[PDB]
Tab-separated table of C-alpha atoms and ligand atoms in Angstrom:
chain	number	residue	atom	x	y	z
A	1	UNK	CA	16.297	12.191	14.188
A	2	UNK	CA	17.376	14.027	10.771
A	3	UNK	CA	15.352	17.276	10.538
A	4	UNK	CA	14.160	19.353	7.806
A	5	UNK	CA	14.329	22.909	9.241
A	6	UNK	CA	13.145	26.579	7.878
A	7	UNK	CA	16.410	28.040	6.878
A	8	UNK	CA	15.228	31.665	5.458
A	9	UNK	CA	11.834	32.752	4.566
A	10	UNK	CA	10.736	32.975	0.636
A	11	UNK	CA	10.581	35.715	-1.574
A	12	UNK	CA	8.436	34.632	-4.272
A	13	UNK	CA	8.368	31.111	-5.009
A	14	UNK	CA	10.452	28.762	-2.211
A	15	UNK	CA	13.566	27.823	-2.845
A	16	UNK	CA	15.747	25.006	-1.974
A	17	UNK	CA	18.167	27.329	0.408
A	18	UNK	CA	14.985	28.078	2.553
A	19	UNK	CA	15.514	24.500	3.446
A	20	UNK	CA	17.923	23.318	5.652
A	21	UNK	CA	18.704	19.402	6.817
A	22	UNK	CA	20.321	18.661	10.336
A	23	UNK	CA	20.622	15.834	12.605
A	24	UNK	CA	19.401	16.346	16.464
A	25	UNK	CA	20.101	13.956	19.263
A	26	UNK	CA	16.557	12.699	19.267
A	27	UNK	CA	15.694	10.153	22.747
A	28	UNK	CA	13.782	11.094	25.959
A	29	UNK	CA	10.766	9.359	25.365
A	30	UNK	CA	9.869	9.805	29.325
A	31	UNK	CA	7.052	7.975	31.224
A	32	UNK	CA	3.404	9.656	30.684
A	33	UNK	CA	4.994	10.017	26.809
A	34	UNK	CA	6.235	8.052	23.655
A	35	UNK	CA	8.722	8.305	20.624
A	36	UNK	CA	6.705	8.084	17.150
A	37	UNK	CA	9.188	7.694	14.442
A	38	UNK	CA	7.451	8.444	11.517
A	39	UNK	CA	7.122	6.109	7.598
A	40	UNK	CA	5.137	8.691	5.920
A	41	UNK	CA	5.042	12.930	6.160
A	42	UNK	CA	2.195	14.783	4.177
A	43	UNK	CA	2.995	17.795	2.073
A	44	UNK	CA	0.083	20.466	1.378
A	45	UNK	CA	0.186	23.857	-0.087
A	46	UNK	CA	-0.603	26.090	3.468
A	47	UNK	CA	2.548	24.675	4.698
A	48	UNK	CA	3.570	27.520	1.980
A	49	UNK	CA	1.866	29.912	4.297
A	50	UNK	CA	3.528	28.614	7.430
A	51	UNK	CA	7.099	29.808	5.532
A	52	UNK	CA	5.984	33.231	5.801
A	53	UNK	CA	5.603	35.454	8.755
A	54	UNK	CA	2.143	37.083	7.500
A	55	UNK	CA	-0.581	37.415	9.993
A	56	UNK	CA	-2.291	34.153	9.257
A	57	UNK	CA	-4.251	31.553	10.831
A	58	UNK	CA	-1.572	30.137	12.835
A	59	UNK	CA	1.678	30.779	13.523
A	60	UNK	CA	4.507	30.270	11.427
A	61	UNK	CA	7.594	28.250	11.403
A	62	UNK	CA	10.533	29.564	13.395
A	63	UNK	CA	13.922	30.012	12.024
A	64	UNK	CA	15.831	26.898	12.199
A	65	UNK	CA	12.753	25.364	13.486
A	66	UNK	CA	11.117	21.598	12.614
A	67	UNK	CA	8.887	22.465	9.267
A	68	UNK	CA	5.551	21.077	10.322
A	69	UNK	CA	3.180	18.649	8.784
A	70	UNK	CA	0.682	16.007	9.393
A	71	UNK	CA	2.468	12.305	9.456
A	72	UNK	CA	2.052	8.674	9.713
A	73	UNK	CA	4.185	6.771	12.356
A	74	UNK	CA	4.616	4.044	14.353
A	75	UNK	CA	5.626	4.383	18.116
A	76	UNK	CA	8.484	2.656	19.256
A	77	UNK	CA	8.909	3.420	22.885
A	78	UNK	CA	6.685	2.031	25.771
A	79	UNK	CA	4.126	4.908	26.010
A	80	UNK	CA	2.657	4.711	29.251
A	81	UNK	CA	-0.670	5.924	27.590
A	82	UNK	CA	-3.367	3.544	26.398
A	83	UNK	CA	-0.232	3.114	23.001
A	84	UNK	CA	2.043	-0.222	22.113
A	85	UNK	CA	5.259	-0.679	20.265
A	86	UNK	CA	4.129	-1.174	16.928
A	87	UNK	CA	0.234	0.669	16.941
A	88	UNK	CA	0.308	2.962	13.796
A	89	UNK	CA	-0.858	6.315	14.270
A	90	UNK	CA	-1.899	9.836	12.402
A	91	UNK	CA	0.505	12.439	14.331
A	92	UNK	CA	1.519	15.997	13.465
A	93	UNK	CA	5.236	15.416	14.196
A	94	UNK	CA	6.639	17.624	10.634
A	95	UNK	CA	9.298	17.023	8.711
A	96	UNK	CA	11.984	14.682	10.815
A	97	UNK	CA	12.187	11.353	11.891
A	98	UNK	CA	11.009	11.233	15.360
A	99	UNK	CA	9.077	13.269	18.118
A	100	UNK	CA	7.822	12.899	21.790
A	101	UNK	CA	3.541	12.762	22.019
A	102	UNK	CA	1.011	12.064	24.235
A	103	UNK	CA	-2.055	12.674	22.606
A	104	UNK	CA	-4.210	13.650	20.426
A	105	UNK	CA	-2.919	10.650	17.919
A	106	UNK	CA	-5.203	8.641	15.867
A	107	UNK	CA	-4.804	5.225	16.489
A	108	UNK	CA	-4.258	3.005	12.627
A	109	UNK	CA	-2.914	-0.295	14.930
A	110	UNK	CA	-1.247	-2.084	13.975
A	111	UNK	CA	1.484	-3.034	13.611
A	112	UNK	CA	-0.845	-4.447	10.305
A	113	UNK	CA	-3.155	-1.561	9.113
A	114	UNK	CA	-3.645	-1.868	5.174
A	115	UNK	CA	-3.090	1.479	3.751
A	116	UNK	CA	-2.043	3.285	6.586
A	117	UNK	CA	-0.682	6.450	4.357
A	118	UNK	CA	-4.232	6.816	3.689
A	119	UNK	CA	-4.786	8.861	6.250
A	120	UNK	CA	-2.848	11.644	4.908
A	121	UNK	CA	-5.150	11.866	1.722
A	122	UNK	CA	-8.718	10.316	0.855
A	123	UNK	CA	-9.184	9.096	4.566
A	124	UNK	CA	-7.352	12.237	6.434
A	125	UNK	CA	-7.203	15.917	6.165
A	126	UNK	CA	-7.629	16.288	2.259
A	127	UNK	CA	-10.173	13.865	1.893
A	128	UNK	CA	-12.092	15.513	4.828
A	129	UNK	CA	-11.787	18.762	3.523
A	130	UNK	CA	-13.292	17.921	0.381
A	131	UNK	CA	-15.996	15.947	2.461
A	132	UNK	CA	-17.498	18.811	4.361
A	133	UNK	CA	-16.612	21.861	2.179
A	134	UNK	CA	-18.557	20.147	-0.264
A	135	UNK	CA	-21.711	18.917	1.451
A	136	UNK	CA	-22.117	21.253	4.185
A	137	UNK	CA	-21.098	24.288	2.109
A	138	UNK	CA	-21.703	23.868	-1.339
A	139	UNK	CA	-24.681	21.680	-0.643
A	140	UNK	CA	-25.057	19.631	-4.096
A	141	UNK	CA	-28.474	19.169	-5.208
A	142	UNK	CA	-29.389	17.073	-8.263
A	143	UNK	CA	-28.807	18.619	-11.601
A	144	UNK	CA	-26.349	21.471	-9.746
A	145	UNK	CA	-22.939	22.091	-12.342
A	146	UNK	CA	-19.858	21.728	-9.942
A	147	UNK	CA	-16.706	23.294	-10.583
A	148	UNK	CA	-13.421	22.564	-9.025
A	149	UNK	CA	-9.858	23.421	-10.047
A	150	UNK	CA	-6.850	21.290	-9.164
A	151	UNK	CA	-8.752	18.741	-9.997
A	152	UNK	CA	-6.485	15.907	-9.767
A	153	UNK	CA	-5.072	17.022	-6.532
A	154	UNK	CA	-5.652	15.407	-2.676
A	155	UNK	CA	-9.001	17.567	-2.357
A	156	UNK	CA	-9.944	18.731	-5.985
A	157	UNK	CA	-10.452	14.975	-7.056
A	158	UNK	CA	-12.215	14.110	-3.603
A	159	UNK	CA	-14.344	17.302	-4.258
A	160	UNK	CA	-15.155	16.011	-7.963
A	161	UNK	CA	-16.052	12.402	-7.105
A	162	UNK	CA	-18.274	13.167	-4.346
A	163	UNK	CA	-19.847	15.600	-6.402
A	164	UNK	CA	-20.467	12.878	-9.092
A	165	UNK	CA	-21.762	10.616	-6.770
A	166	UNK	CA	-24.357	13.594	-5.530
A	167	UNK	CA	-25.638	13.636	-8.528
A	168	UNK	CA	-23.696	16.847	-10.028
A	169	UNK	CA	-22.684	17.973	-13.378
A	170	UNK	CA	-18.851	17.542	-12.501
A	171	UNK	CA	-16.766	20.604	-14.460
A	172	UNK	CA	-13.263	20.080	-13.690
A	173	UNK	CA	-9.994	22.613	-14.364
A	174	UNK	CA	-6.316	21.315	-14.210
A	175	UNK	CA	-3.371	22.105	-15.786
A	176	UNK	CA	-2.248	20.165	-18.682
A	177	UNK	CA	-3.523	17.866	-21.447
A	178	UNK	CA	-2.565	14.459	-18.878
A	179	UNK	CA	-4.137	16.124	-15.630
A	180	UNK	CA	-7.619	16.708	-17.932
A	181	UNK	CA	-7.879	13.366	-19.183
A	182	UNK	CA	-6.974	11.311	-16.256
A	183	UNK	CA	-9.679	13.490	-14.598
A	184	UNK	CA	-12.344	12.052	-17.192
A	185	UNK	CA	-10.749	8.755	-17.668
A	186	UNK	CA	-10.088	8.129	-14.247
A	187	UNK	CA	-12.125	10.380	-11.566
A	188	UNK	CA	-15.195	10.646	-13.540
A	189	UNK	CA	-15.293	13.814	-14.302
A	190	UNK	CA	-17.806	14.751	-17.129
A	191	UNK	CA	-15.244	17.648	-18.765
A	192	UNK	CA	-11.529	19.263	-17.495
A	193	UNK	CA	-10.888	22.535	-19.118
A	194	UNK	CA	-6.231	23.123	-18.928
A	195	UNK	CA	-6.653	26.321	-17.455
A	196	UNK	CA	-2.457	26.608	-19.398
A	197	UNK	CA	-4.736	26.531	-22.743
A	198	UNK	CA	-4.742	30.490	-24.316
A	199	UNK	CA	-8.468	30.289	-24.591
A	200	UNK	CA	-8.986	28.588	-20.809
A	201	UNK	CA	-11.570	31.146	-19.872
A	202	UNK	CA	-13.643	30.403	-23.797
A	203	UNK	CA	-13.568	26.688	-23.017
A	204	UNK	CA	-14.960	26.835	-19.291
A	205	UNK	CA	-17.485	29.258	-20.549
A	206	UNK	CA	-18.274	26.590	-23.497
A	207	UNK	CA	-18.688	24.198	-21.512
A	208	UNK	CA	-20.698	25.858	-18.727
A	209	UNK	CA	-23.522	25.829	-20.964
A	210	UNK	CA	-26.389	26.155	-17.963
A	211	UNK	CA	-23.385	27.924	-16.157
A	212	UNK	CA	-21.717	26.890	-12.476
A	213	UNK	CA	-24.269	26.444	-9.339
A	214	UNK	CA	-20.983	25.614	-7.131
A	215	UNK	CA	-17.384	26.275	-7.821
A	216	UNK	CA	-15.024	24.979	-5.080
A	217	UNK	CA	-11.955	27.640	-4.513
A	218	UNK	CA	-8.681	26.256	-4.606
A	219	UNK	CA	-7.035	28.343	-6.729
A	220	UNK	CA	-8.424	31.530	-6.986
A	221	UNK	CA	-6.666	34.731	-9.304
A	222	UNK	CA	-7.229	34.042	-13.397
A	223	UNK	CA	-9.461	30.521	-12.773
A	224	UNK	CA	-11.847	32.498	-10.762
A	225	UNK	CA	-12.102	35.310	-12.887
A	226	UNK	CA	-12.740	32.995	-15.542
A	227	UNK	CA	-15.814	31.338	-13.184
A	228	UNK	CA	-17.195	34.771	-12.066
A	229	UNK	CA	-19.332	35.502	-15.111
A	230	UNK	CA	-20.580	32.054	-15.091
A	231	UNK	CA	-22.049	31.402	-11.829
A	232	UNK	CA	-25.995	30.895	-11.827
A	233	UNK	CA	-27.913	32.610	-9.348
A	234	UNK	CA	-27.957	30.608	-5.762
A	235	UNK	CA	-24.370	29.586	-6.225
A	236	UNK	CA	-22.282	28.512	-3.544
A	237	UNK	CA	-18.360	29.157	-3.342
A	238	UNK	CA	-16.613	27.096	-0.579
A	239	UNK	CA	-13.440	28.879	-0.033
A	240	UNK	CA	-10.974	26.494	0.562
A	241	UNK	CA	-7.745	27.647	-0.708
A	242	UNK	CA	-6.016	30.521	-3.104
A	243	UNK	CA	-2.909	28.402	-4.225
A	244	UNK	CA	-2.438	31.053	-7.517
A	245	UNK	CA	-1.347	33.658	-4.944
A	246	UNK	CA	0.536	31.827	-2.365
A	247	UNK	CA	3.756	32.874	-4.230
A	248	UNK	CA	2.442	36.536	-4.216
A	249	UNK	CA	4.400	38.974	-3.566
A	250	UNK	CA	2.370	42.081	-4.125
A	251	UNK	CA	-1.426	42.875	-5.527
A	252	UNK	CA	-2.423	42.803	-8.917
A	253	UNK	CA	-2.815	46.370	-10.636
A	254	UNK	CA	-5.788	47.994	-12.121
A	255	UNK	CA	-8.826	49.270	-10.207
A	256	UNK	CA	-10.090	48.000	-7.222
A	257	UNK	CA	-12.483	44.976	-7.965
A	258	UNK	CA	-13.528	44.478	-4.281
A	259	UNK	CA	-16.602	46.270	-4.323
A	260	UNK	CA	-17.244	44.190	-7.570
A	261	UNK	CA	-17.136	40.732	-5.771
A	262	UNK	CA	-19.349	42.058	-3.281
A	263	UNK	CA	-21.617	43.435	-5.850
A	264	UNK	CA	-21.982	40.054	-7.835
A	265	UNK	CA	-22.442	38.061	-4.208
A	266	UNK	CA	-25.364	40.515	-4.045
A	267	UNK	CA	-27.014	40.452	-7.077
A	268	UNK	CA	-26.436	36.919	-7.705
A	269	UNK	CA	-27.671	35.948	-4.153
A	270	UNK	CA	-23.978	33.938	-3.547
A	271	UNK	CA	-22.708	31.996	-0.578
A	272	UNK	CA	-19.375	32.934	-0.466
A	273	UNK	CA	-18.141	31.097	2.852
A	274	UNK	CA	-14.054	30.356	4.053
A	275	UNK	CA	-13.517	27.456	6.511
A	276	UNK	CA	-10.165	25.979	7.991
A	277	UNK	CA	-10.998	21.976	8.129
A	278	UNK	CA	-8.653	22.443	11.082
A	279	UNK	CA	-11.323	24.028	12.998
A	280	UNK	CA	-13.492	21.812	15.435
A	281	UNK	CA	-15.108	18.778	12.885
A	282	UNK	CA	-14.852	16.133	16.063
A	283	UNK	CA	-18.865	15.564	15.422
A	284	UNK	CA	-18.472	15.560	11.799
A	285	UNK	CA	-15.151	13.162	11.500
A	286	UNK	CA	-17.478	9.795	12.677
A	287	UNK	CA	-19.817	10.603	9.330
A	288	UNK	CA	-17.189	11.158	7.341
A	289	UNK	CA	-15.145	8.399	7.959
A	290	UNK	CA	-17.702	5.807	7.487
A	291	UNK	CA	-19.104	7.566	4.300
A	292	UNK	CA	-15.685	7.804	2.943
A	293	UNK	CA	-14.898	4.159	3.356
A	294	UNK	CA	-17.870	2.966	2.018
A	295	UNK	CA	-17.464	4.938	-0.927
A	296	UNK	CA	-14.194	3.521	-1.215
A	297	UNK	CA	-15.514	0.004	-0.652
A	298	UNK	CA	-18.185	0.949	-3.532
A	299	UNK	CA	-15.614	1.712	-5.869
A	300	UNK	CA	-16.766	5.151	-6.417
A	301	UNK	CA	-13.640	6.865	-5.199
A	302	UNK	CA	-10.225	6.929	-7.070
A	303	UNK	CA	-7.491	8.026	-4.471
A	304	UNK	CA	-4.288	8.408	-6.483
A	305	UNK	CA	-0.810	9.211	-3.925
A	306	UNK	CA	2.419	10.332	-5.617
A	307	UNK	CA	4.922	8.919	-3.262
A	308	UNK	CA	8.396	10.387	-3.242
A	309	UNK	CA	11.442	8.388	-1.272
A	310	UNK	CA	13.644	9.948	0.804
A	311	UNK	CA	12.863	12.467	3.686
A	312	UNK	CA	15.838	14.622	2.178
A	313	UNK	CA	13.921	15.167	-0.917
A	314	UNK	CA	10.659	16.444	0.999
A	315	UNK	CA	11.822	20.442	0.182
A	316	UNK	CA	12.279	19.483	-3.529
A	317	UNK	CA	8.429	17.885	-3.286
A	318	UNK	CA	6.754	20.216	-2.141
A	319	UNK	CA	8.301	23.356	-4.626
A	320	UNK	CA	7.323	21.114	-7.076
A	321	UNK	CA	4.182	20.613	-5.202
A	322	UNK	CA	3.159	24.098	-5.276
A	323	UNK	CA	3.879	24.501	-9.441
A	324	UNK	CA	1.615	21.692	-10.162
A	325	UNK	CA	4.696	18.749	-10.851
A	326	UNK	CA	2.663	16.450	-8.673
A	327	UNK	CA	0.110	13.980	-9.400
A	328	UNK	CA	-2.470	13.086	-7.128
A	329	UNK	CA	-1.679	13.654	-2.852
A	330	UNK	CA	1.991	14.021	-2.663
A	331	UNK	CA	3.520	12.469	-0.060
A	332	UNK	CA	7.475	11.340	1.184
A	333	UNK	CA	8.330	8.124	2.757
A	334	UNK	CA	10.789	8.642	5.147
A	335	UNK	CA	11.539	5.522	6.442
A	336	UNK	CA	10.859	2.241	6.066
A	337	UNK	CA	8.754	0.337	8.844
B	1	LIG	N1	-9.224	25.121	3.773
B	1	LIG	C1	-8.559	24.001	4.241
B	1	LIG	O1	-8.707	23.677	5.426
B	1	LIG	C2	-7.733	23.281	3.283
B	1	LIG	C3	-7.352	23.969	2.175
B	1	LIG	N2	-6.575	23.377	1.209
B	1	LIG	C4	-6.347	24.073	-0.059
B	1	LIG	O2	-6.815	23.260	-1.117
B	1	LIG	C5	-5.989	23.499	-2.275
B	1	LIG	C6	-5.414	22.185	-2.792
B	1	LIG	O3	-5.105	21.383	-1.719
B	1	LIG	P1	-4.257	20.003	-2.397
B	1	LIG	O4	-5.384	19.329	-3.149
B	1	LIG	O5	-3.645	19.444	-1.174
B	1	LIG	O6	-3.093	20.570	-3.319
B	1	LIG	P2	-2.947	19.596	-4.642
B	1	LIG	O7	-2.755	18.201	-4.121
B	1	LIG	O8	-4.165	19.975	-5.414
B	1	LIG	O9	-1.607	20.052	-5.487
B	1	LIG	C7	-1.706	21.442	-5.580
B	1	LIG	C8	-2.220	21.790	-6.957
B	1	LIG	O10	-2.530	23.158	-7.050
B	1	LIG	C9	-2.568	23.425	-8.461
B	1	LIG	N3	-1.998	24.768	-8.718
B	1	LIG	C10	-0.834	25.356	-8.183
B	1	LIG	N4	-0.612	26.613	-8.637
B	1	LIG	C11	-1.691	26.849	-9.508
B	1	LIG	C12	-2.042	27.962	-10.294
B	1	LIG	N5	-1.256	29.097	-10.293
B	1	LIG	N6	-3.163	27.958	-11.079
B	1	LIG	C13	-3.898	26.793	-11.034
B	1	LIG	N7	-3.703	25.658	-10.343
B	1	LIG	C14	-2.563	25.710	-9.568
B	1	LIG	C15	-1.784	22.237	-9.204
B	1	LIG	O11	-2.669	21.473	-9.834
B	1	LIG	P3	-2.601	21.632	-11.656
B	1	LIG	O12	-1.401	20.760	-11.892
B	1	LIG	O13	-3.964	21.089	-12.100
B	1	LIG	O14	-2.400	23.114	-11.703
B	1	LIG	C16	-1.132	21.537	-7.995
B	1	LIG	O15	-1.020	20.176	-8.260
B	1	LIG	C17	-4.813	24.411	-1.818
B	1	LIG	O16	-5.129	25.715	-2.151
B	1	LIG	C18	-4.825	24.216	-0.308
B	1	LIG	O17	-4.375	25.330	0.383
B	1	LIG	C19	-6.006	22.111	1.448
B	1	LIG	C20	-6.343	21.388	2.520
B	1	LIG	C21	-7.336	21.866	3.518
């Protein structure tokens, strides 16, 4: 297996030297165990997170070590477990060609699932994410204004959609004149405000006319001060990600604003609640799934994919990834099936 590995850990935004490619001597599948050799690797922004040796969530990536990340792949040696030669499967085997598992896969079998890259986006993690930090956070009720930056992204569009469908007010914030439009022409949405444009906070504000019962976090820094202001009493703020600040690499200045947050959460009676979708959703995965794919049946959810070629392109990807060059879920093929 070729290998992307974690050559040095970023300052500031990554570079392409934090990357490093190397072939392994890549065989033992073992009996109890199989080889996956994977078609299709997910990028996402925490990966970011998982450069850096912060006190986080989870651990991060070793030096020299596999850069991890949800994939698609196809085993190809006789797992002794209840897996064939060919079954398609939703593994976490990172950014190289093949690994060793035995459990907890997804089976996609296979060898003839339709889209099985799917499962990285609108029927995997991003899609999920969007699922339940929407519904069983936010909790849309008729009439509600939803707001939601990266719009056009793997959870900001699944966010926006669902929302529509739920009978919201669907405010979305992207970056660029393209990202906005597609976002109305495409996903539904009733506005997208560039949050690039000089007068981003003036627009939102314009047209947050009743202002925002629930803004989904993905971005956080000048797009939520720009929301803060507008949110209506009873608002709920899922707090899925911060993306502005995952290049941080110190506070902003001025006075401390802390006790301001907490301040407006109090007087504005606001759900403020952070979840990892990585947590423990096993009873919640079923419901999604089959809401998902009806929805998708329905033809009330647009998944877009930005597919890249080449597994030695993936650390290219995902910089861009993190400054907004893709265009819907980014993912790299690595190899063909
Ligand atoms: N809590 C959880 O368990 C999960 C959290 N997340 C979080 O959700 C967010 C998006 O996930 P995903 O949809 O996969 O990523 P996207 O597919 O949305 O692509 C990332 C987008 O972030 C936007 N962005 C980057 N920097 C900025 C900035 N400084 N200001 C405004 N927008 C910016 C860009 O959209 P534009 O071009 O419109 O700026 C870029 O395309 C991330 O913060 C991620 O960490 C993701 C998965 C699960």
């Amino acid at each position: 297996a070729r290998q992307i590995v974690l050559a040095s850990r970023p300052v500031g935004a990554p570079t392409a030297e934090n990357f490093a490619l190397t072939q392994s001597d890549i065989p033992t599948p073992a009996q109890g165990e199989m080889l996956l050799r994977s078609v299709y690797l997910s990028l996402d922004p925490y990966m970011r997170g998982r450069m850096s040796d912060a006190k986080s969530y989870a651990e991060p990536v070793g030096i020299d070590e596999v850069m991890v990340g949800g994939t698609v792949c196809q085993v190809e040696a006789s797992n002794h477990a209840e897996f064939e030669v060919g079954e398609w499967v939703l593994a976490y085997t990172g950014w190289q060609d093949y690994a060793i598992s035995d459990g907890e896969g997804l089976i996609k079998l296979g060898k003839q699932p339709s889209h099985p890259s799917y499962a990285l986006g609108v029927m995997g993690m991003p899609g999920f994410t969007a699922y339940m930090g929407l519904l069983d956070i936010g909790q849309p009720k008729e009439g509600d204004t939803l707001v939601v930056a990266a719009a056009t992204g793997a959870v900001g569009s699944m966010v926006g959609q669902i929302g529509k469908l739920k009978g919201c007010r669907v405010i979305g914030i992207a970056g660029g004149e393209e990202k906005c439009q597609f976002a109305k022409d495409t996903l539904g949405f009733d506005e997208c405000i560039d949050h690039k444009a000089a007068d981003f906070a003036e627009q939102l504000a314009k047209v947050c006319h009743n202002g925002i019962d629930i803004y989904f976090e993905n971005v956080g820094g000048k797009v939520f001060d720009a929301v803060m202001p507008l949110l209506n009493t009873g608002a709920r703020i899922p707090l899925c990600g911060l993306i502005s600040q995952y290049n941080a690499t110190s506070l902003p200045e001025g006075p401390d604003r802390m006790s301001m947050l907490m301040a407006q959460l109090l007087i504005k009676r606001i759900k403020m609640q952070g979840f990892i979708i990585f947590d423990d959703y096993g009873h919640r995965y079923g419901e999604f799934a089959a809401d998902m794919t009806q929805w998708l049946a329905q033809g009330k959810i647009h998944y877009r994919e930005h597919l890249v070629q080449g597994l030695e392109n993936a650390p290219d990807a995902f910089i861009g990834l993190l400054e907004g060059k893709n265009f819907g879920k980014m993912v790299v093929q690595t190899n063909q099936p």
